[PDB]
């Protein structure tokens, strides 16, 4: 069984190291990392590559040998390293949830106010909060209370003997982030549903309003110099070449509707004809007339359930047993706890498959940087 465990944990470490290391080098060779949206994924891979290369290997050695043979200093260094890193990925999931939440509730205000300097600073807070929350307590609670409670040869968080400090830090690391992430992604699911009907009624109102009134209102909004719309025009124009791709993939009747509308938009400037064309296609595709709304809402439901259940099914068994143990010490037999402590690292090997490999730009550069072609 030691050979079976060593093989299965070794493959998960090789898969995690290869999965995250390739993600870091995918957009270094590829000139498409001029995106602050991918900064959070780039930093997420930094924490998960640390877990894959350094945490799974030193934990599997801790269980297979049934012993920590690297000394107390390496135990505290590993414990601080993987608790801060797993926490950093958790608050990079919270940072990503907050970024996606404010890009759907305030798509214009948030994007205009978000700059590469600001996004990088936000990542700095996700790592600084993780650092302060975990590194001081793990590395020095044996000096806050002057005694090394951790058993020699064992390696666990040394302050978990405290009954209220454990509850507090489990709230700040898992419970509050889980409720905040669940609520934020719940409002994301609802906002996606509202965006279905909203865009549908807007698509109706393009028909009612004459095109000249829409054009004159576009000029009346693009003349008043506002940084909210100046960025919006550049973003809309930039994604025009890959927005007409979905026009071919649109409905048969809807394709003729777009073709007729762009015919009237002929002889118009590039910053106004392409800006107007994006609005019509956005409400045409995502309007969800009869069943497209259900398909898109369920698509979001499946993606969000997979993203969230990769958090509950990976972290809740660990955190539930920590809280339960604080009430009844003689509970949750050790075999259950051991499997649940390893189970947390399963998020680090699946996270690249949920946010990086889910993108179309990724999952294709991987083959270019792995097949050497």
């Amino acid at each position: 069984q030691v050979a079976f465990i060593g093989i299965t944990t070794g493959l998960l470490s090789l898969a995690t190291v290869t999965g995250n290391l390739l993600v870091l080098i995918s957009f270094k060779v590829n000139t498409e990392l001029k995106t602050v949206n991918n900064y959070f994924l780039l930093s997420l891979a930094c924490a998960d590559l640390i877990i894959g290369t350094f945490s799974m290997n030193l934990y599997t050695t801790y269980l297979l040998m049934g012993h920590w043979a690297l000394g107390t200093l390496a135990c505290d260094l590993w414990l601080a390293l993987d608790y801060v890193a797993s926490n950093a990925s958790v608050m990079n999931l919270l940072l990503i949830s907050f970024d996606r939440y404010f890009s759907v509730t305030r798509p214009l205000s948030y994007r205009a106010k978000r700059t590469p300097r600001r996004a990088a600073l936000m990542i700095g807070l996700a790592w600084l909060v993780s650092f302060v929350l975990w590194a001081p307590a793990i590395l020095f609670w044996q000096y806050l209370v002057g005694e090394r409670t951790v058993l020699a040869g064992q390696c666990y968080i040394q302050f978990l003997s405290q009954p209220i400090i454990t509850f507090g830090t489990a709230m700040a690391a898992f419970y509050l982030p889980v409720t905040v992430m669940c609520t934020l992604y719940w409002r994301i699911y609802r906002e996606t549903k509202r965006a279905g009907e909203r865009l549908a009624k807007l698509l109706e109102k393009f028909e009612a309003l004459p095109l000249e009134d829409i054009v004159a209102a576009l000029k009346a909004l693009l003349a008043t110099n506002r940084p909210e719309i100046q960025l919006a025009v550049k973003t809309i124009v930039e994604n025009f070449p890959e927005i007409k791709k979905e026009a071919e993939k649109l409905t048969p009747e809807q394709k003729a509707k777009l073709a007729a509308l762009e015919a009237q938009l002929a002889d118009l400037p590039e910053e106004l004809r392409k800006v107007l064309l994006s609005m019509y296609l956005t409400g045409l595709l995502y309007g969800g007339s009869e069943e497209n709304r259900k398909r898109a809402i369920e698509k979001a439901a499946r993606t969000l359930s997979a993203i969230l259940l990769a958090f509950i099914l990976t972290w809740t068994p660990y955190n539930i047993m920590v809280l339960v143990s604080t009430f009844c010490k003689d509970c949750v037999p050790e075999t259950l706890w051991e499997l649940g402590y390893w189970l947390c690292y399963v998020n680090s090997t699946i996270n690249p498959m949920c946010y990086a490999l889910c993108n179309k730009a990724f999952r294709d550069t991987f083959r270019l940087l792995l097949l050497c072609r």
Partner: nanobody, 111 residues
Framework: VQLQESGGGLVQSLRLSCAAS????????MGWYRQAPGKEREFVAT???????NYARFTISRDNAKNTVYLQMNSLKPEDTAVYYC????????????????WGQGTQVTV
């Protein structure tokens, strides 16, 4: 559970023992602390699952037939004198939350 260390000690190489009538010591944690005046809790050596060891000269061996340990020391120096208390049921327990019945009785090894 009572941890009766069967090794008296006072050997001027030696051989310690600890017969602790336990229920589940498989896949657990057996060890020894050389509790001397210098340090109240000092690492000595530990057997464990997989028959892997880790010292602080000596040798420590396992036996799962009767839940027993043999700290077969070799060429022990005079500084090795201490009160070795058995430490099974450490089980490298996370937050010692299952059963730390490890304390037991301590020997008197004099070198």
């Amino acid at each position: 559970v009572q941890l009766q260390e069967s090794g008296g000690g006072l050997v001027q190489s030696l051989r310690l023992s600890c017969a602790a009538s336990g229920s589940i010591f498989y896949g657990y944690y057996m060890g020894w602390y050389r509790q001397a005046p210098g340090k109240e809790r000092e690492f000595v050596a530990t057997i464990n699952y997989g028959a892997s060891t880790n010292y602080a000269r000596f040798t420590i061996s396992r036996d799962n037939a009767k839940n027993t340990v043999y700290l077969q020391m070799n060429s022990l120096k005079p500084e090795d004198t201490a009160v070795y208390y058995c430490a099974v049921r450490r089980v490298y327990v996370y937050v010692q939350r299952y059963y730390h019945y490890y304390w037991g009785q301590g020997t008197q090894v004099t070198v």
